From a paper:
The [name] small ([name]) complex recognizes [name] trimethylation on lysine 36 ([name]) and deacetylates histones H3 and H4 at multiple sites across transcribed regions. The [name] histone deacetylase (HDAC) complex recognizes [name] at coding regions and suppresses transcription from cryptic promoters via its deacetylase activity in yeast. Here we solved the cryo-electron microscopy structures of [name] [name] in its free and [name] nucleosome-bound states. We demonstrated a unique architecture of [name], in which two copies of [name]–[name] heterodimers are asymmetrically assembled with [name] and [name] to form a catalytic core complex.
To explore the underlying molecular basis, we reconstituted the [name] modified ‘designer’ nucleosome and prepared cross-linked [name]–nucleosome complex for cryo-EM studies. Two engagement modes (‘close’ and ‘loose’) of the [name]–nucleosome complexes were acquired in global density maps of 4.0 and 4.0 Å, respectively. In this case, one [name] associates with the nucleosome disc from one side by grabbing two [name] marks and positions its catalytic centre of [name] next to the N-terminal tail of [name] for deacetylation. Our structures revealed multivalent engagements between [name] and [name] nucleosome, including two pairs of CHDEaf3–[name] recognition, MIDRco1–linker DNA interaction, and [name] HID–nucleosomal DNA interaction, which collectively contribute to the positioning of the H4 N-terminal tail towards the catalytic centre of [name]. The nucleosomal DNA at SHL +2.5 is recognized by the HID-C region of [name] with multiple electrostatic or hydrogen bonding pairs involving residues Q937, K941, H1221, Q1222 and K1244 of [name] and backbone phosphates across the DNA minor groove. Structural alignment revealed rotational displacement of the [name] catalytic core from the close to the loose states, in which the MID domain of [name]-A within the right arm leaves the linker DNA next to SHL +7 in the loose state. The existence of two engagement modes suggests dynamic association between the [name] enzyme and its nucleosomal substrate, which may be beneficial for enzymatic turnover towards different acetylation sites occurred to histones H3 and H4 tails. Moreover, our structural study revealed that the catalytic centre of [name] is far away from the H2A and H2B tails in the context of a nucleosome, consistent with a primary role of [name] in H3 and H4 deacetylation. Histone [name] dual-mark readout by [name] over a single nucleosome positions the catalytic centre of [name] next to the [name] N-terminal tail for efficient deacetylation. Our structural studies show that the [name] complex primarily binds to a single nucleosome through readout of dual [name] mark.
Residue numbers in the entry:
A (entry chain L): 22 to 102
B (entry chain H): 23 to 101
C (entry chain I): 12 to 118
D (entry chain G): 69 to 134
E (entry chain K): 36 to 134
F (entry chain J), G (entry chain N): 29 to 121
Amino acid sequence: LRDNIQGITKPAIRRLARRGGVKRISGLIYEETRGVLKVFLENVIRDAVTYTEHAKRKTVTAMDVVYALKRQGRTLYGFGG
Amino acid sequence: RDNIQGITKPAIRRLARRGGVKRISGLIYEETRGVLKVFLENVIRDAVTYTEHAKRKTVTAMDVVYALKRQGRTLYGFG
Amino acid sequence: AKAKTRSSRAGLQFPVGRVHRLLRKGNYAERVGAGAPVYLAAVLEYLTAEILELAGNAARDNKKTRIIPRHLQLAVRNDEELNKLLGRVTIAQGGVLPNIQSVLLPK
Amino acid sequence: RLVREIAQDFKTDLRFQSSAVMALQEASEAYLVALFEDTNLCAIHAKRVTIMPKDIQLARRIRGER
Amino acid sequence: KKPHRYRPGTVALREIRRYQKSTELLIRKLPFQRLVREIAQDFKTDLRFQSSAVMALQEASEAYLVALFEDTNLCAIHAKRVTIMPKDIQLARRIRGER
Amino acid sequence: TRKESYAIYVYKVLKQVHPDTGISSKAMSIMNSFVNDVFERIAGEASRLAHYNKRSTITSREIQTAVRLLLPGELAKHAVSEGTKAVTKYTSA
Amino acid sequence: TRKESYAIYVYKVLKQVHPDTGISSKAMSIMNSFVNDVFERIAGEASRLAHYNKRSTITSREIQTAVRLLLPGELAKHAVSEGTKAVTKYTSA
DNA sequence: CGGGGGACAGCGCGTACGTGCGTTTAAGCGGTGCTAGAGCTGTCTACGACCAATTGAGCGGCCTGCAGACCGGGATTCTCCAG
DNA sequence: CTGGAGAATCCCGGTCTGCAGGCCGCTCAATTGGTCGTAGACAGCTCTAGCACCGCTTAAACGCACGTACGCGCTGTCCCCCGC
């Protein structure tokens, strides 16, 4: 598993910005977006894995993700509750 | 009764300076007055709620501490 | 006498007994008062009624007979107080409010 | 005086510990200073050295207060 | 005998309208799962994943990214511009408290 | 095993206000999660209130105070009215 | 009556790290507030974890997980080391 | 990959700022005085925990018809341009 | 201004299908009734601090004159992002 952050293609970020209400986009944005997304994903997954390990489990559940998001002040509905 | 005008422009300028602000427009002062008023309502409402639930008539500092804490603004040095 | 549900006694749709059980099992306090579960059930029922009413209005506006997450998001975000309450909540498959800034409009 | 005047549309005849008043002043001043610094950053981003209330509005909007 | 091309920006507005009404995910699922597993590799090996978990991460990330894009658009407009600059993103994240 | 939820009561309320409106499963789970979250918020605030006042009981007064603290304006007032009405009805009957 | 605090223990810690540095009352008041804040954060997170795994007991493992979740990086590592060492020493003693 | 239109650099200006001095004010301090109300104490009583027996509401499993999704083809709208 | 032209979108039948919702058996969690212990509701007492007042004092706010630099409008250039 190497070089997957390039998997987020430029059209994907373009669609994300269009949903975000962005009309004109600079070309040197996408790598910054990828870095920020990587930071966010790392922060969430760290706590998710911490929860999974404290339960002595080997698979990560969505419910662990729910707790991790809740502890970071980002509550998500519709994934088990 | 216009205690909102008790917040004179020198105090606003001083706060901006501590905030690292160099040049200030003249329209700023009233905007700060309004924003500060909104903040004060938000805190004081909860403070009075806590004071009333305790069936008290005097607001204690601990009430303000709880109100600030539940708003995401933790304060130390008062209990 | 025959058993009569406390929800019926207070005329509510939500299970007061389950609420009391959860209150006792949540380590919230040593003892739980008698009327507190009723109060909580009433509040939950009222809030549920509010959100469901707005979601149904939105779904009928979209001309569908079932409420989907999109309608829920629209109802929550369009209401000032509901959006204020759910300010830090992410709704799965909720989409976004179709809002466009004026300066980007073609002139 | 401003605090006492504000503390009238929730209840009447409210007594106050001094410590509550000073804690309110501390919190208010800290919040105002932080808002000022954010406003300064916003104005600088607009290639300016003078802050006008639209900067405050944008700062509070991004902060989520708005 | 003309290509009949639309002016720069109207297509952008049309796709903004398109994507502000939809709710589906905008990212390919397989690359996102691969990246998620790659990131998780650095915390614990041989980790298994429920699919609902990966969907949860995708939804949360896309929502957060949309919010950040909306804030960045406001920041850039404050600079009286139309194109988004990375400095706008940095300022927005700093103001949010993430920096 | 068996898991419980608020599905039946939510469906009842839906039929009460919009008798001719259906609901999808995902949305139904969304309401379930929403109810759970509100429950946790009110319960935690009530527990903090009780601990602050050095009390052993969670009464309806604490629930009302927590509702006032956690709800914005008109929502808080209407919820307080509903809770008081339900408490009065249950006490009478 | 009498109110307890952390003044003596913080004073001893200060004398360990800076055996000559004094302190003002406002500073140690802030110290006690910070100590209480951290205590409540960790204890609440530990209780949340225990309820998450359907367990009635709070052990040192729960506190270790809570500290790992609440403290960033090197602080978390060092605190884990301190807690482990103290636990091992107390058990051996 | 063509190209337009947006980013940006540079310049004029006039005014809304900053800066300093004379003036008025009200904040701050110290003192006196009063009492409302916080805080503490004894009591008992009503209310909540707890347990035994009962049962029916709600959860699990099954099934189904229709809401909604998916085609396709005209109908209608929106935008661009040449006049 | 203003028709055409072309592309984009809407809409209305027509068809299929997964799940929303209803039905059913069962069981365990809610209910009912009775016991008992004890938390707090309540009355009563104390005395602290919060409120109000007054008189000085002087630092700070205020008003104002004045001058300049900066925010803003305008213009020309180019490059780079968009439509395809």
